Design an enzyme around this catalytic site. Structure first.
Site, mmCIF file in Angstrom:
data_model
loop_
_atom_site.group_PDB
_atom_site.id
_atom_site.type_symbol
_atom_site.label_atom_id
_atom_site.label_comp_id
_atom_site.label_asym_id
_atom_site.label_seq_id
_atom_site.Cartn_x
_atom_site.Cartn_y
_atom_site.Cartn_z
ATOM 1 N N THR A 1 0.825 -1.240 0.000
ATOM 2 C CA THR A 1 0.000 0.000 0.000
ATOM 3 C C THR A 1 0.840 1.261 0.000
ATOM 4 O O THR A 1 1.931 1.299 0.559
ATOM 5 C CB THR A 1 -0.933 0.057 1.220
ATOM 6 O OG1 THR A 1 -1.382 -1.260 1.553
ATOM 7 C CG2 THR A 1 -2.126 0.948 0.939
ATOM 8 N N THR A 2 0.311 2.299 -0.642
ATOM 9 C CA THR A 2 0.861 3.645 -0.572
ATOM 10 C C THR A 2 -0.303 4.620 -0.573
ATOM 11 O O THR A 2 -0.833 4.955 -1.635
ATOM 12 C CB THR A 2 1.799 3.933 -1.745
ATOM 13 O OG1 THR A 2 2.783 2.898 -1.840
ATOM 14 C CG2 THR A 2 2.495 5.272 -1.552
ATOM 15 N N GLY B 1 4.516 1.175 1.329
ATOM 16 C CA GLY B 1 5.318 1.935 0.393
ATOM 17 C C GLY B 1 5.652 3.341 0.826
ATOM 18 O O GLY B 1 6.490 3.985 0.192
ATOM 19 N N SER C 1 3.062 -2.249 -3.518
ATOM 20 C CA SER C 1 2.405 -1.086 -4.092
ATOM 21 C C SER C 1 2.547 -1.138 -5.603
ATOM 22 O O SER C 1 3.650 -1.344 -6.119
ATOM 23 C CB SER C 1 3.005 0.214 -3.555
ATOM 24 O OG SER C 1 2.866 0.294 -2.149
#
Lengths: 225, 234, 225, 219, 228, 218, 233, 233, 194
Positions: free
Chosen positions: I1-2, I128, I167
């Site tokens: 994830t970002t 991320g 990500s």
């Protein structure tokens, strides 16, 4: 003294009768007329809807489905019927969870009537003021506030119940024609000319119960006229 | 037979017990709350039932939190329960959101806590009129609550027995661009205008202000601030 | 109709809350005088019978704190225990002495609950709390759920005469000395009890509290005999 | 009013329960150091009705027996609690419950229904009976009172039977019990049973002798 | 009122509940040499399903008179308790255990102040110690064993007939039912006039069965002819 | 297994393989992995077989009571929310992952529901042991489609999982829920064809009976 | 007698007297009208007491939840109580349903919660009447409920004082395919049949709802023009 | 129930609770008893309520041993007294458990007084009954001094040098104010108490219709009939 | 994830990737991480997928409830606080949220895993985010315009995608302003081809 929440509102009178149960039966008897007709091919169930208060008759329903094979209609006060309908849906869904089949009419009526009767012995509670006609499995059951049920061939609940019940005896026949026969029977007990909007019809055929759409009820009346 | 045995409807739809509660509330000591852009004040009669009481240390105004305070007339001990529950609810609400409780939330709490007394059987209607003054987003509002729970926001309001005379004087009054001390002056004057000496005992004044000069914090004025006004209108 | 339980009568008053005022007048007289520096409790105790021991109406909550009450003694003992527990909690968990007025906050909330609802019993006890807190402070607790600070008060049977005797001299309490306050308390008792012999060295117990000093019982010889 | 005092200082419902316990079939008993004789009378208006045995065992190894007068359905619950008390006491403690402990706990059960609202006093005079080391009879009031009886009677018109027993100090307790019962009942209307409780054994007396002795009283 | 005593020392609510039973449909029972007859009189033709006589477990049957809702509630309760007994001890209970269950619940309901007694009575057909038995339970919860009993409409008349018109002679249940019909007709003609409302059970501990109205009419012709 | 879900313009396609397994042993052939929830909603799950049936049965109850009470066909979001609120409290101990698809008054919706109670609205889905084999076909072949092209893409996706996953095989069940209603194709394909083996019969004399007791139904 | 008057039980006539008395209490309250056509919902009601020291805008139409409104009459405290209860139920049912609750679901939930106050003794049944309304997936829906715990799908509700005259007018003139401005006229005329056609615009408030926007109130001049049009024809 | 609890807790216009006033009438509808305190001993004599002579005298005991050095006599409704005795024994044993000592009699009196008026409390151990106990108690014990305490159904208690309860209470008090002197020996004290008791007894005083408890620094003695015989003459 | 959130001249701009993964496998590559709490409040979920969804489902009704009790626009502050209690009261629920909205002024609230709530001018989260703290620190500018802030989020999330394996995908963006919410889309075609 203020309201005693622990009071037993249902008791035997000195004449052996339950005082409040008879009043609840009277309250149920005043409801809108609804009938059912058993036939060799199935069962019909019809009821009348009041058009007052700008009620959307197309959306307002008087005959309800509990399971694919059971239907129900009432005479009495609507809120009590709505609570009893929630209870009946719970009963049928529990049975379907356990056994995976559609609840039979007799078992459903028994389990339902016991919980109806619960309120004739519950402290600080009055019995439901509704009479119920339950149609399914080629049979009919009338359930009263006492929690007492009886299987019927032709039954009426609400206004004009006894004389309508006698008329239904004169208006039985094959299911396909029995719908129109019983519509004629109950046309004798309506305060105004009945449009298709003013009547619900539910018929048990074969293995399932289905409530006629407003368009189907027009077809039944086109046969009437 | 009148069905006033409990909080139940009469055949005409009236709840008699709430009427009796309103009779009790309407006979309490008067408190006047006047609201203005620059601040808010409340005046409160404190009748001298006996000179043994230390009136300067017995307070009619009870604080709900730093930004809400209220006063009641009638059976004023019911304000103890109402204030305790309001405080418990609203302190937790304020600190669980890290922001002030709004006027509408205070009104919701007031109505819902007062209604249950007019709603249950083994319970007795609250029997007080209640003025709840609050500050929110740099605005002041006065909430006058009846025995039914009906509470409305007012620009200025009065409770207690002398409400009938005070209300007309308030209607004669313009609050825009009045200084807080002008509000104190007018409140004391109007309170004394409803004294009616032959029927009510002499009273001391309790004044609580909530204005910019105190950054909106509730401040209970000491007697030396308005002894001159009391001397003027005695 | 309105006498038996907690509801407004048609005039708008609760009769039980008036009856508790008669209830709190049952106990023997307690006379309390306060000055900024010191305060006095004067009591009248009568042996219920020739063979009954005195009931010691005055209870010390803590050094520099005294409590006394009139009415149902069970509620008074409950309040004494409540005040002791509150003193312990405030000293330990809050690092301070009990506030004379706010120490009664929970008790007032409970009393208000009792006055608002049926089933719960109203407190039938009226209490006087004389404590040193930024000076000597005297508090009157009422069964309706309100604690108010007073310059001097009298509770118990025939307490109105003591109250009026005290009230005729309230403005001079801040100038009287300890002997003067004790003399005025004994004078109030005498006005309530003008019958000679009834008040004696045995029936009257005088309690002295001075700011920044412990509370002590002092002999009544110098003031009645 | 229920579980509360009346204006004159009376527990009205408790005394009503006492009266209801008096309106029951008469039971008469008498005891000596080594035996008890227990006699019960029953209504014979119905030939088709089968009379139930009113002397029920509470615990067979302790030789405790139970009898009652008054509302019959309440007797079922009280007897069930007597048996439960014996069994639970043996489970918890590991030793047989003494007769006095059983009487005390059954009396507490009786009292329980008179201390609370929402519940109705039993209204039965219950008799606990044992012969292990000596004869001992407890009569438990519906309100929870209980005390030992050397001999006595309970139920319909039992006060007269007790008054007669006061004078009928005959050595033979069978004589005493049956004659005391005979002061009230009618042989034509009342069928009578008599039992002798002995050391860990029980037996009922012959009809001929009991009837003969009963015939000589209230002639 | 409620469940409380009175100056007379009686529970008036229970007495009214008992009075309620006599307004219900007639039910009769009779112990015989080879079984127990359980008879019930419905108010309408009811071949669709049995309504006056039910089964609790393989060796206990019950007749019903009074409030139908309470009757079915406690019938289901008794069936559930019989199944619980079978679950516990792995065999079916006798008549006494069902009597005890239902009597305990009924007594609980006549002792609790905030509830009303059950307005119905049961007659239990069963066996004990290898001999047939016939119990009964009133709204009060009292358990009565009977050689024969009746409840419902004409309860007093039929009970009196059993008291003094039924022969004391031990008889097999065929002659037992014949005599029941004899005394019932003597009390009222409607019993011998019509038979489609009847439910009659020939309780045998292992092979109980219900009688068809053809069999009832076969009894009817016998009673009609025996007096001619 | 390879239960797959594809969303097209006016409906959803939910396909699955008809195989069940417990270890290296195949337990059930022709197994129906598509569970009924509503006339407009179907759910297909992977994981503990008992948890799929009971979780999808709870949704069926709640959605049946809802539609019966309110005379209003249930939304897919209502089914997913019911499943999420049930699965999440158990922390995934009730191991049920579902592909819930249906058509409501708001259109066609297809959801992925996981044992811990997370959900995800998606355009196409694969689940079970054959998801990776299936998702490869869906990745390459997915686009904006009608029901015909959606049918074949999903069936091609299942076929890939059946052929390449050890624990997937037998037939392909297909169920399409469109705005016109749901239609089922049980054993839509028989990719896992078996051989035509003859019968084998023992002599009846090959078994000896020690003792026999006969009971009759009545 | 007093047994039936006080307790929520059926009397010998088959009615619960307490519910009838609450209905009377509602009937004595201010008049209010909610009326809908195929495209919009129109609600009009009598404005509350005009206190000079008032520092609030007091409207009988309260937003309960997004795209879900209420229009209740009766005791002010009871109306407020049922509004807050409806908000509670709406948020709980929106949590359970996975989507924002609609007027029909909320009416059913609210009435099912009110029914116990009708079947049991201990809590007074709120004296209120009115309609929960809004837009359900683009369609205007109005559901009527009151103290008796009923819930019907209605074209509109006329509650408060002289509700029967309002009903007689509205049923006579109302139709579903009625135009928007004609709907305004019919609703306000139904209200005026209770208030009296000579009432000035300051005495009543009007609001209307449309699919994609919040509830909107008619301006003072708008209500003046509407009343002039109604009096014209 | 709320109604029954309110009936328990209703105050009279004169003050005292109605239930307390009725319990105070019930408290003396029993057999008489006398308690005497002297700086060496405390006595407690009561006439047995032998309803019939067939009821054996042994089993109608009226004194209950509350603890090692506390005895409890009573008058009025005797059913309540066994519950009071059980809770008093529990309190004394709990006090020894906490503090390893025999409690002061005053402490037991305080505990019972606190428990008396707790009708409403929902836990059994924090109340005696749902009503005042219909018995008046004379509690004696030794706590470094002979102690005589009387507990009334009102929850009030007083330490006494001498008191009489039961139907003969007033007569025995009017006799005590003349006859009682605490400077008297224990045997002569027993003679005096028995003489005073015999004045009110329905039948002739003997060693089988009388129960005597004498608590001293040395023993908590209960006198056998063969010992009461010494003092009856 | 970002997940990323930046406050700019006239509102809030939140950016996020689309990849959701278990292990080395991307279970879905179109996941929407910008969860709408209300029409003016958006939540960027990070942490346990099931737990963060549970919270945002509850915060959705709580913020609406209080909004209609208060009779005013939903408060992003109240939604953030309501999230903090649930995240704090239930340590077993691994949840960390960025709650950003616009009630009266744009606000960003960051709820860490243990319930630590802080108000921020810009915030990033997810696995991320570790690789763009230096890029966001040097490149952030107070009071950016929409285009300047959109470039900033575009640059930061792109560089997190190119480094963090968890990500990937296109950059979902959503600008909450007083005028409403406008969604954006930066296709991975541009990001990957570059």
């Amino acid at each position: 003294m203020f309201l005693d929440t622990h009071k037993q509102l249902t008791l035997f009178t000195s004449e052996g009768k339950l005082d409040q149960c008879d009043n609840a039966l009277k309250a149920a008897t005043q409801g809108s007329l609804s009938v059912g007709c058993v036939s060799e091919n199935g069962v019909v169930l019809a009821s009348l809807k009041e058009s007052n208060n700008l009620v959307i008759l197309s959306e307002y329903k008087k005959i309800y489905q509990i399971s694919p094979n059971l239907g129900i209609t009432y005479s009495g006060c609507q809120p009590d019927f709505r609570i009893q309908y929630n209870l009946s849906l719970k009963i049928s869904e529990e049975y379907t969870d356990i056994y995976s089949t559609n609840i039979p009419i007799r078992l459903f009526v028994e389990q339902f009537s016991r919980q109806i009767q619960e309120y004739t012995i519950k402290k600080g509670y009055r019995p439901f003021g509704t009479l119920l006609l339950i149609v399914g499995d080629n049979k009919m059951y009338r359930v009263d506030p006492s929690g007492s049920y009886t299987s019927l061939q032709v039954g009426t609940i609400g206004r004009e119940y006894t004389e309508s019940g006698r008329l239904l005896e004169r208006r039985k026949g094959m299911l396909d024609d029995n719908i129109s026969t019983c519509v004629e029977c109950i046309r004798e007990y309506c305060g105004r000319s009945v449009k298709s909007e003013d009547i619900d019809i539910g018929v048990y055929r074969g293995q399932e119960f289905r409530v006629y759409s407003k368009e189907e009820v027009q077809e039944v009346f086109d046969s009437i006229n | 037979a009148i069905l006033d045995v409990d909080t139940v409807y009469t055949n005409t739809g009236d709840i008699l017990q709430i009427g009796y509660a309103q009779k009790a509330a309407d006979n309490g000591n008067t408190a006047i709350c006047m609201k203005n852009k620059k601040g808010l004040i409340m005046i409160a009669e404190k009748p001298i039932e006996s000179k043994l009481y230390v009136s300067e240390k017995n307070f009619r105004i009870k604080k709900v939190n730093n930004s809400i305070f209220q006063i009641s007339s009638g059976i004023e001990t019911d304000l103890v329960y109402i204030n305790e529950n309001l405080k418990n609810n609203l302190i937790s609400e304020k600190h669980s959101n890290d922001m002030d409780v709004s006027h509408e939330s205070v009104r919701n709490q007031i109505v819902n806590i007062i209604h249950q007394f007019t709603r249950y059987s083994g319970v007795r209607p609250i029997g007080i009129n209640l003025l709840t003054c609050s500050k929110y987003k740099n605005e002041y509002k006065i909430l006058q609550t009846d025995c039914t729970g009906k509470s409305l926001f007012f620009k200025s309001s009065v409770i207690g027995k002398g409400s009938r005379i005070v209300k007309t004087e308030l209607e004669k009054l313009n609050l825009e661009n009045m200084e807080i001390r002008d509000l104190v002056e007018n409140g004391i004057r109007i309170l004394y205008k409803s004294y009616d000496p032959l029927k009510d005992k002499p009273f001391d004044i309790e004044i609580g202000i909530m204005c910019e000069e105190t950054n909106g914090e509730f401040v209970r004025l000491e007697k030396n601030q308005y002894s001159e006004i009391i001397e003027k209108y005695k | 109709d309105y006498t038996n339980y907690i509801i407004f009568n048609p005039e708008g008053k609760i009769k039980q809350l008036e009856f508790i005022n008669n209830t709190v007048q049952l106990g023997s007289t307690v006379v309390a005088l306060k000055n900024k520096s010191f305060g006095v409790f004067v009591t009248y105790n009568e042996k219920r019978s020739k063979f009954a021991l005195q009931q010691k109406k005055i209870f010390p909550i803590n050094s520099k704190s005294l409590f006394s009450f009139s009415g149902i003694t069970n509620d008074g003992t409950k309040i004494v225990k409540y005040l002791k527990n509150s003193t312990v909690f405030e000293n330990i968990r809050k690092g301070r002495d009990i506030h004379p007025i706010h120490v009664f906050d929970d008790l007032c909330y409970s009393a208000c609950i009792r006055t608002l609802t049926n089933g719960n019993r109203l407190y039938g006890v009226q209490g006087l709390l004389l404590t040193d807190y930024q000076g000597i402070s005297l508090v009157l607790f009422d069964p309706k759920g309100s604690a108010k600070e007073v310059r001097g008060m009298s509770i118990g049977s025939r307490s109105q005469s003591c109250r009026t005797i005290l009230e005729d001299e309230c403005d001079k309490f801040e100038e009287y000395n300890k002997e003067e306050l004790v003399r005025l308390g004994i004078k109030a008792l005498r006005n309530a009890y003008p019958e000679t012999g009834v008040l004696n060295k045995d029936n009257v117990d005088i309690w002295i509290l001075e700011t920044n000093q412990e509370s002590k019982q002092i002999k009544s010889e110098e003031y009645l005999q | 009013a229920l579980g509360i005092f009346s204006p004159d200082g009376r527990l009205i419902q408790v005394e009503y329960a006492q009266q209801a316990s008096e309106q029951g079939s008469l039971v008469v008993f008498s005891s000596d150091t080594n035996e008890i004789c227990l006699s019960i009378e029953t209504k014979t208006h119905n030939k088709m009705l089968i009379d139930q045995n009113k002397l029920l065992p509470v615990d067979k190894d302790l030789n405790i027996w139970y009898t009652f007068s008054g509302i019959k359905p309440d007797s079922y619950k009280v007897l069930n609690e007597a048996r439960l008390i014996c069994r639970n006491y043996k489970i918890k403690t590991g030793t047989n419950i003494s007769f006095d402990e059983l009487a005390y706990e059954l009396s507490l059960y009786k009292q329980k229904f008179t201390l609370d609202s929402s519940m109705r006093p039993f209204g039965i005079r219950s008799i606990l009976l044992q012969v292990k080391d000596m004869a001992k009879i407890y009569v438990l009031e519906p309100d929870g009172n209980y005390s030992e009886y050397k001999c006595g009677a309970v139920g319909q018109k039992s006060v007269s039977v007790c008054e007669y027993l006061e004078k009928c100090e005959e050595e033979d307790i069978i004589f005493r019990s049956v004659s005391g019962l005979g002061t009230v009942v009618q042989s034509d209307k009342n069928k009578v049973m008599s039992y002798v409780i002995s050391k860990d054994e029980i037996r009922r007396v012959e009809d001929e002798t009991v009837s003969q002795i009963i015939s000589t009283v209230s002639v | 009122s409620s469940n409380t005593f009175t100056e007379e020392g009686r529970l008036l609510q229970t007495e009214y509940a008992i009075k309620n039973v006599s307004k219900g449909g007639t039910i009769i029972g009779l112990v015989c040499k080879d079984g127990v007859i359980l008879l019930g009189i419905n108010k309408t033709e009811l071949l669709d399903e049995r309504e006056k006589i039910y089964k609790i477990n393989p060796k206990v049957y019950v007749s019903v008179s009074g409030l139908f809702g309470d009757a079915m509630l406690l019938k289901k309760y008794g069936q559930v308790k019989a199944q619980d007994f079978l679950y516990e001890f792995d065999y079916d209970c006798d008549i006494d255990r069902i009597c005890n269950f239902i009597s305990e619940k009924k007594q609980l309901f006549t002792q609790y102040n905030s509830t009303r007694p059950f307005g119905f009575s049961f007659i239990y057909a069963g066996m004990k110690n290898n001999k047939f038995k016939l119990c009964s339970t009133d709204p009060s919860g009292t358990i009565n064993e009977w050689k024969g009993v009746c409840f419902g409409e004409n309860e007093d008349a039929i009970n009196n007939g059993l008291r003094n018109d039924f022969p004391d002679e031990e008889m097999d249940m065929e002659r037992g039912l014949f005599e029941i019909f004899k005394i019932l007709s003597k009390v009222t003609e409607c019993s011998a006039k019509d038979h489609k409302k009847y439910e009659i059970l020939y309780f045998k501990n292992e092979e109980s069965r219900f009688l068809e109205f053809e069999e009832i009419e076969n009894i009817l012709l016998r009673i009609e002819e025996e007096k001619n | 297994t390879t239960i797959v879900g594809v969303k097209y313009k006016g409906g959803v396609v939910i396909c699955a393989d008809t195989r069940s397994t417990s270890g290296p042993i195949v337990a059930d052939k022709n197994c129906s992995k598509i569970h009924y929830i509503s006339d407009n909603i179907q759910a297909c799950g992977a994981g503990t077989s008992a948890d799929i049936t009971r979780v999808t049965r709870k949704a069926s109850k709640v959605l049946s009571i809802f539609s019966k009470t309110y005379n209003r066909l249930p939304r897919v979001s209502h089914c997913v929310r019911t499943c999420q609120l049930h699965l999440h409290p158990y922390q995934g101990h009730i191991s049920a992952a579902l592909v819930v698809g249906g058509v409501d008054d708001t259109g066609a919706h297809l959801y992925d529901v996981y044992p811990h109670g997370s959900s995800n609205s998606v355009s196409y889905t694969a689940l079970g042991s054959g998801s990776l084999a299936a998702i490869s076909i869906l990745e390459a072949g997915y686009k904006d489609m009608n029901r015909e092209e959606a049918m074949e893409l999903a069936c091609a996706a299942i076929e890939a999982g059946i052929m390449n996953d050890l624990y997937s095989g037998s037939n392909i069940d297909v169920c399409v829920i469109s705005q016109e209603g749901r239609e089922m194709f049980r054993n839509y394909k028989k990719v896992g064809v078996r051989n035509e083996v003859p019968k084998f019969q023992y002599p009846r004399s090959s078994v000896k009976i020690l003792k026999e007791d006969i009971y009759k139904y009545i | 007698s007093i047994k039936d008057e006080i307790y929520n039980i059926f009397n010998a006539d088959g009615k619960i007297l307490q519910i009838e008395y609450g209905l009377e209490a509602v009937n004595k309250s201010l008049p209010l009208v909610v009326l809908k056509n195929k495209n919009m919902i129109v609600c009009a009601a009598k404005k509350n007491q005009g206190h000079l020291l008032e520092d609030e805008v007091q409207t009988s139409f309260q937003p309960i939840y997004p795209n879900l409104y209420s229009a209740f009459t009766g005791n002010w405290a009871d109306v407020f109580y049922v509004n807050s209860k409806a908000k509670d139920l709406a948020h709980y049912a929106s949590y359970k349903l996975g989507f924002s609750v609609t007027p029909d679901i909320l009416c059913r939930k609210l009435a099912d919660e009110l029914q116990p106050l009708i079947q049991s003794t201990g809590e007074r049944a709120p004296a209120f009447a009115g309609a929960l309304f809004g837009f359900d997936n683009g369609k205007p829906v109005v559901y009527m409920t009151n103290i008796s715990a009923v819930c019907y799908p209605v074209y509109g509700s006329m509650v408060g004082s002289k509700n029967q005259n309002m009903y007689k007018y509205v049923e006579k003139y109302y139709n579903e395919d009625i135009e928007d401005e004609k709907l305004f006229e019919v609703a306000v005329g139904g209200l005026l049949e209770s208030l009296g056609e000579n009432s000035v615009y300051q005495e009543m408030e009007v609001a209307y709802l449309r699919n994609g926007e919040v509830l909107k109130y008619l301006d003072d001049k708008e209500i003046e023009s509407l009343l002039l049009s109604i009096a014209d024809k | 129930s709320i109604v029954s609890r309110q009936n328990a807790n209703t105050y009279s216009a004169e003050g005292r609770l109605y239930q307390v006033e009725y319990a105070m009438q019930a408290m003396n509808l029993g057999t008489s008893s006398i308690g005497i305190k002297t700086k060496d001993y405390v006595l407690l004599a009561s006439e047995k309520k032998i309803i019939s002579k067939l009821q054996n005298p042994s089993s109608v005991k009226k004194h209950y041993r509350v603890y090692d050095h506390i005895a409890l006599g009573f008058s009025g409704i005797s059913a309540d007294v066994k519950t009071i005795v059980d809770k008093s024994r529990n309190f004394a044993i709990n006090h020894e458990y906490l503090y390893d000592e025999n409690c002061k009699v005053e402490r037991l009196l305080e505990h019972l007084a606190d428990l008396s008026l707790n009708f409403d409390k929902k836990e059994a151990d924090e109340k005696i009954f749902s009503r005042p106990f219909g018995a008046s108690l004379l509690i004696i014990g030794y706590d470094t001094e002979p102690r005589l305490f009387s507990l009334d159904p009102s929850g009030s208690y007083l330490e006494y040098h001498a008191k009489a309860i039961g139907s003969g209470s007033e007569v025995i008090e009017n006799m005590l104010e003349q006859e009682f002197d605490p400077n008297v020996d224990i045997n002569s004290g027993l003679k005096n108490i028995l003489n005073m008791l015999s004045k009110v007894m329905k039948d002739k005083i003997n060693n089988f219709n009388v129960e005597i408890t004498a608590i001293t620094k040395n023993e908590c003695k209960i006198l056998t009939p063969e010992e009461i015989e010494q003092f009856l003459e | 994830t970002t997940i990323m959130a930046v406050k700019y001249a006239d509102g809030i701009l939140i950016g996020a990737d689309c990849r959701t993964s278990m292990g080395t496998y991307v279970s879905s590559r179109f996941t929407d991480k910008l969860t709408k709490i209300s029409d003016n409040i958006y939540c960027c979920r990070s942490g346990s997928a099931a737990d963060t969804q549970a919270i945002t489902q509850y915060i959705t009704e709580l913020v609406q409830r209080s909004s209609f009790i208060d009779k005013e626009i939903p408060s992003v502050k109240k939604a953030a606080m309501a999230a903090k209690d649930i995240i704090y009261r239930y340590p077993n629920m691994l949840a960390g949220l960025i709650i950003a909205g616009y009630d009266t002024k744009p606000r960003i609230f960051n709820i860490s895993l243990g319930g630590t709530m802080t108000e921020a001018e810009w915030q990033i989260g997810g696995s991320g985010s570790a690789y763009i703290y230096g890029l966001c620190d040097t490149t952030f500018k107070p009071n950016m315009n929409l285009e300047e802030a959109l470039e900033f989020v575009k640059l930061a999330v792109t560089c997190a995608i190119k480094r963090d394996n968890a990500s990937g995908g296109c950059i979902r963006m959503a600008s909450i302003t007083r005028e409403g919410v406008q969604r954006f889309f930066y296709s991975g075609d541009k990001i990957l081809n570059s």
